[PDB]
Design an enzyme around this catalytic site. Structure first.
Site, PDB file in Angstrom:
ATOM      1  N   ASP A 309     -49.744  -9.983 -53.769  1.00 14.91           N
ATOM      2  CA  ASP A 309     -49.904 -11.736 -53.738  1.00 14.91           C
ATOM      3  C   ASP A 309     -51.449 -11.917 -53.896  1.00 14.91           C
ATOM      4  OD1 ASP A 309     -50.112 -14.407 -52.863  1.00 14.91           O
ATOM      5  OD2 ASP A 309     -48.248 -14.335 -51.901  1.00 14.91           O
ATOM      6  N   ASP A 565     -47.869 -12.129 -47.413  1.00 13.69           N
ATOM      7  CA  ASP A 565     -48.014 -12.495 -46.048  1.00 13.69           C
ATOM      8  C   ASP A 565     -46.903 -13.817 -45.641  1.00 13.69           C
ATOM      9  OD1 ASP A 565     -49.135 -14.271 -47.891  1.00 13.69           O
ATOM     10  OD2 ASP A 565     -50.512 -15.073 -46.882  1.00 13.69           O
ATOM     11  N   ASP A 569     -42.843 -14.283 -49.751  1.00 13.10           N
ATOM     12  CA  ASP A 569     -42.795 -13.157 -50.293  1.00 13.10           C
ATOM     13  C   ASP A 569     -41.694 -12.101 -49.440  1.00 13.10           C
ATOM     14  OD1 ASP A 569     -45.031 -14.307 -51.464  1.00 13.10           O
ATOM     15  OD2 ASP A 569     -46.520 -12.947 -50.383  1.00 13.10           O
TER      16      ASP A 569
END
Lengths: 821, 19
Positions: A309, A565, A569
């Protein structure tokens, strides 16, 4: 996956009155509670699941066979081994999940709603679609909705969902998402979804969907177990043909079948592999990396793509300032000072921009020292229309100074409206603003005025998602380990591209939606796979696009680790071979990530990689060892039964299995070197090496056996028992094979660790006492016979070392076994 | 009004403690 849209008929709630209690009850009945289904499996079901596996079914069959044949020692040992394996795995995974339940923090949710014409605080679960929710400073939005206050300006932090650490500006009619935090503004929002239908709800739904998916480690282990079962069935077919042809009794046949099944099936393979992975997991937890699924340790060894990410994992979550642009004659200290005087001085209610400016003041001591001496007279906060904060302040000399911080173009226009700027300054200003916008920086122009004097424009202050201090050293160290880092993010293409350039990554970042990851792209499947494989990242990535990229990369044969996080995701965390939740991840993402980092940052992925490769080395060494074990004893005992209608005493066979398993349990603590290159299960090479080692061991054992048929005893000197001698020689060579398979080259190159060496030596000693005192054997054996057996075993061990060295360093052997020329 | 809500220098030190 498809959100059930709430019909607009239900969303036209009068904001001034809200919903009625009867309507609240009806909508609660129709749509349920605002709480995702938190299914988390059962502990007893999981303990049972540990027994549900291919090798475990064959050991259950073998235990039933032992119970039927009244060989209660066999049944008891098999059940003890199975329960030990399941207990070890269950205890480790319970310890792992205890941490996940530990770092849980999200609670105390209370939504303020307009009902029956009054504002009432209710628990977050009672909110229903159509409700009118109050959004205040700091309010955590519990449900998705649409703003219904017309003259409304909200700044809502959607980092938890889109990754953006930057408060998105929301107006009338804009959608809001659950778990997003209102960083600024006041308003009312009509609820549009709840529970699982929410964006976070659908993310959790994808998580619970992928949570039943099996891991690559387990499929490799299942394949090995199935091939070993096939070999066992072949050996049993040979044995049964031979026994039939001698009109052998059923009891003798079943005893031989039990003996062959106990040894040829790898009883301790799941146990020793899980124990090695658990010891590695403990080492990682000491390195501040907590593994949820042990199998992920294997996957993290061969992982070749790390999909990270951008925000919260690769970067920080503070809108940090970068080097400011200053107009000629304006010192950076002056620009910092002016930007700060145009900021709220109250500890409570500070905006993100002002907070970042104040934090960057540490690097500008002159501004820090001058700030306290200026007395603020008036302050006009950020007005979205003019888009500038203003501050009328009084200098220690008694001069009144007006400071302004706004949009570069709006501040430029404010300066121009008072006096004409030189054209060179205007062009330089606009050019740098355009560069910063292209680089994704959120530029903030600054200006001031002294007394009755004219406006002075001071410069630009960039404001972007800063890369975490320990990320470049962890995106270059990962690449040194054969790992390819790919960024995934919801931020614009420009911001992601600039963050990559700042991290040293590639700049080939592609808009995920446009490339067709959503399924709407005309691009063929193979072309899409190639583009995904070679792309340096993806921007404007929705959760489904993260899942799609991970899925495509996995389908191309790559083991993919992923970091994130937010719950958004989480589907990609559980779908990726190694889901890594960074510090600060949500409970759903943590429950989805296979490895949860407990310390801040992405620095603990390199130690995780090294330790995972060490664990894979230990596991591969043990797997080669045990496959050679199984093939050796299958060949030896099957040919023995077929040819001479006799086989080693069943108790001795059980003890051989116990000894191999218990001696190998110490492999988990072995000092295996780490691989410099990413490591994969070269299964054809593994099976070829194991087959050759098994054949060599079988030849050695057969020579030892056939020496005992001579009328003088052969290897036996003075006196001895054949069963005991064969037990001893088999145990010795089999144990010492571990010192051979564990070495990366000649078996003397890697000094054995004291845990493994002591275990092997203790098992050799116990086998020696078994033979000498004739436990479950015909008679004692002379000590010189044992010495002869030891020397013969040492010779066989050296032969095995030569064979393994030649096979391992041989690229030609690897090619031959893999089919290549 | 929330006027006496100041002493930002303390905030200055507090904010970048991650250093």
């Amino acid at each position: 996956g498809e959100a059930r849209p709430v019909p607009e008929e239900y969303l036209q709630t009068d904001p001034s009155y809200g919903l009625t209690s009867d309507e609240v009850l009806k909508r609660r009945k129709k749509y349920g509670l605002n709480q995702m289904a938190d299914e988390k499996e059962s502990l007893v079901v999981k303990f049972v699941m540990f027994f549900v596996g291919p090798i475990q079914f064959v050991m259950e069959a073998a235990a039933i066979l032992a119970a039927g044949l009244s060989d209660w020692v066999d049944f008891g040992v098999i059940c003890g081994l199975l329960m030990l394996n399941a207990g070890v795995g269950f205890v480790q995974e319970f310890q792992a999940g205890s941490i996940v339940d530990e770092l849980k923090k999200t609670l105390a949710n209370t939504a303020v709603v307009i009902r029956d014409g009054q504002l009432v605080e209710i628990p977050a679960n009672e909110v229903v679609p159509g409700d009118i929710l109050q959004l205040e400073d700091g309010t955590v939005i519990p449900t998705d909705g649409r703003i219904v206050t017309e003259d409304c300006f909200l700044q809502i932090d959607q980092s938890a969902i889109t990754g953006e650490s930057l408060a998105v500006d929301k107006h009338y009619g804009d959608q809001t998402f659950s778990s997003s935090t209102v960083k600024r503004g006041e308003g009312f929002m009509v609820v549009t979804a709840t529970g699982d239908n929410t964006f976070v709800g659908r993310a959790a739904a994808l998580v619970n969907k992928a949570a039943g998916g099996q891991g690559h480690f387990t499929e490799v282990l299942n394949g090995i177990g199935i091939i070993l079962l096939v070999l066992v069935i072949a050996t049993l077919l040979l044995v049964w043909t031979a026994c039939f042809y001698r009109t052998n009794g059923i009891v003798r046949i079943l005893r031989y079948t039990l003996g062959i099944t106990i040894i040829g099936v790898p009883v301790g393979l799941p146990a020793v592999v899980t124990t090695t992975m658990a010891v590695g997991a403990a080492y990682l937890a000491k390195k501040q990396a907590i593994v949820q699924k042990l199998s992920a340790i294997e996957s993290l060894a061969g992982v070749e793509i790390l999909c990270s990410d951008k925000t919260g994992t690769l970067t920080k979550n503070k809108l940090s300032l970068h080097e400011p642009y200053t107009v000629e004659g304006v010192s950076p200290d002056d620009l910092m000072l002016t930007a700060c005087l145009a900021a709220s001085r109250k500890k409570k209610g500070l905006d993100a921009i002002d907070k970042a400016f104040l934090k960057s003041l540490k690097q500008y001591p002159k501004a820090k020292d001058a700030l306290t001496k200026y007395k603020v007279l008036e302050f006009h906060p950020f007005d979205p229309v003019s888009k500038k904060v203003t501050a009328v302040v009084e200098s220690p000399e008694g001069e009144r100074i007006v400071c302004v911080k706004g949009a570069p173009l709006f501040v430029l226009k404010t300066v121009e409206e008072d006096h004409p700027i030189p054209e060179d300054v205007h062009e330089n200003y606009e050019n740098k603003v355009a560069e910063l916008a292209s680089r994704g920086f959120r530029a903030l122009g600054v200006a001031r005025k002294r007394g009755e004097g004219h406006w002075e424009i001071l410069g630009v202050m960039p404001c972007m998602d800063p890369p975490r201090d320990d990320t470049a050293q962890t995106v270059s160290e990962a690449r040194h380990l054969g790992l390819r880092v790919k960024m995934l993010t919801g931020d614009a293409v420009g911001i992601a591209k600039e963050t990559c350039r700042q991290l040293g990554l590639g700049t080939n970042i592609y808009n995920a939606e446009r490339l067709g990851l959503g399924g709407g792209g005309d691009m063929p499947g193979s072309e899409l796979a190639d583009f995904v494989e070679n792309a340096d990242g993806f921007a404007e990535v929705f959760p489904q696009h993260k899942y799609r990229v991970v899925e495509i990369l996995q389908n191309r044969g790559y083991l993919v680790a992923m970091t994130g996080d937010g719950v958004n995701d989480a589907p990609s965390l559980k779908k990726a071979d190694t889901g890594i939740a960074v510090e600060g991840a949500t409970d759903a993402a943590r429950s989805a990530a296979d490895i949860v980092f407990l310390a801040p940052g992405l620095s603990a992925i390199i130690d995780a990689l090294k330790t995972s490769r060490q664990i894979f080395h230990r596991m591969y060494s043990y797997v080669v060892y045990r496959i050679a074990l199984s093939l050796h004893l299958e060949i030896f005992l099957g040919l023995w039964i077929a040819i001479l209608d006799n086989s080693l005493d069943i108790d001795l066979i059980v003890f051989i299995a116990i000894f191999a398993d218990v001696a190998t349990l110490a492999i988990a603590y072995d000092n295996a070197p780490y691989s410099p290159k990413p490591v994969k299960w070269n299964l054809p090479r593994l099976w070829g090496m194991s087959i050759i080692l098994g054949i060599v061991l079988a030849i050695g054992s057969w020579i030892t056996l056939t020496t005992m048929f001579l009328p003088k005893g052969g290897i036996i000197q003075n006196f001895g028992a054949m069963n005991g001698i064969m037990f001893l020689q088999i145990s010795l060579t089999e144990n010492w094979l571990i010192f051979i398979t564990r070495a990366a080259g000649p078996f003397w190159s890697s000094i054995p660790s004291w845990q493994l060496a002591g275990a092997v030596f203790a098992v050799d000693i116990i086998a020696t006492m078994f033979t000498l005192f004739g436990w479950w054997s015909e008679n004692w054996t002379d000590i010189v016979t044992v010495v002869r057996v030891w020397i013969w075993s040492i010779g066989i061990f050296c032969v095995l070392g030569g064979f393994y060295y030649e096979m391992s360093t041989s690229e030609a052997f690897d090619r031959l076994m893999n089919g290549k020329p």
